Design a binder for this molecule. Structure first.
Ligand SMILES: COC(=O)c1ccc(O)cc1O
Ligand SMILES: COC(=O)c1ccc(O)cc1O
Ligand SMILES: Nc1nc2ccccc2[nH]1
Lengths: 188, 185
């Protein structure tokens, strides 16, 4: 990921005017929609947290968690750390990223800081649900000037996305003021 | 450098008991000694700055500044960013690293943060001198508990090295409390 860290703008866009910042969210949302679409219920939830982080949850199959035979770490870690621009860009430019995968009856958790995993992906519990949750805190060493997420930017785009993704329920919640929306197009 | 950042202990030593922290200095010094050897005056200066950083200067030839034919960046940057553990380890585990190379009549500078160059190696002026200077600020995200350099740990090792590298002058200065030593065999 050092190529990304060296010139973040080439990968995420303008790091000073808010466009790249919001692109971080959109990239994560794109992956979540792809996960959601591979299932029947299909719901993603995008939350703006009070601490300036954004989380995206889906109820898909869960990102694969087995050890990659060549890389020697979990498949999920490979996806997060090896170079849509890919979620690895988002991870690289996040001061923190929390990953929770529910899959095969197990909860898996991992934390990254600036794209560096703090520990290997760990099974920390049991669950009857499936899905992937990514919560990221954009790096304030990278994102300058505009550093807070604008609800309207996310809502406008999530609305447009709903009409191209039939059957996918998209919920948006802003924990800073309680505002929420629900975009669900059932066409097709 | 991500392999290093992921398991810093495996590359530099214990990051909690002061071991690794001091090893950072020793790695830089090894490079410096090698540079000093290949020069005329043969002196290196190790300084513990008041802001918990350490600088190592030599009067050697200056590390090569030309573009590495294969990597496409300065040879100096290749050394600082591509994996005696190598100075790239120190760079990866430093929140900041300043590189100053005096070579072929020119001063060159570059700044890294957590191993990431802030800009390409750049010519900033002219000089009659030659040598390399590296100043690093260890990452307090990596080094915990023992985070301040212990003068005596550095002194002991530099003394050992002075006997082994006879002819090379080694100065140690602590700017925190004015303490200083000169190792020369
Ligand atoms: C490749 O999968 C991902 O990156 C991802 C998947 C699901 C999700 O809710 C968020 C994500 O970032
Ligand atoms: C590659 O060399 C280095 O890392 C280096 C570091 C410090 C120094 O005084 C001289 C050097 O050559
Ligand atoms: N604060 C900070 N910035 C970083 C950039 C790359 C890797 C680790 C880092 N820690």
């Amino acid at each position: 990921l050092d190529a990304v860290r060296k010139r973040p703008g080439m990968y995420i866009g303008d790091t000073d005017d808010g466009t790249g910042l919001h692109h971080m969210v959109f990239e994560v949302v794109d992956n979540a929609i792809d996960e959601a679409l591979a299932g029947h219920c299909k719901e993603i939830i995008v939350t703006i947290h009070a601490d300036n982080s954004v989380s995206v949850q889906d109820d898909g199959r869960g990102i694969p968690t087995g050890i990659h035979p060549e890389e020697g770490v979990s498949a999920a870690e490979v996806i997060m750390t090896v170079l849509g621009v890919g979620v690895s860009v988002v991870n690289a430019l996040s001061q923190k990223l929390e990953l929770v995968i529910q899959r095969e009856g197990k909860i898996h958790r991992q934390i990254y800081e600036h794209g560096v995993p703090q520990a290997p992906l760990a099974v920390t519990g049991e669950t009857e649900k499936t899905g992937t949750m990514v919560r990221f805190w954009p790096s304030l060493e990278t994102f300058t000037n505009v550093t807070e997420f604008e609800y309207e930017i996310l809502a406008k785009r999530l609305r447009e996305l709903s009409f191209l993704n039939s059957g996918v329920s998209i919920r948006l919640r802003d924990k800073r003021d309680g505002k929420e929306d629900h975009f669900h197009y059932e066409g097709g």
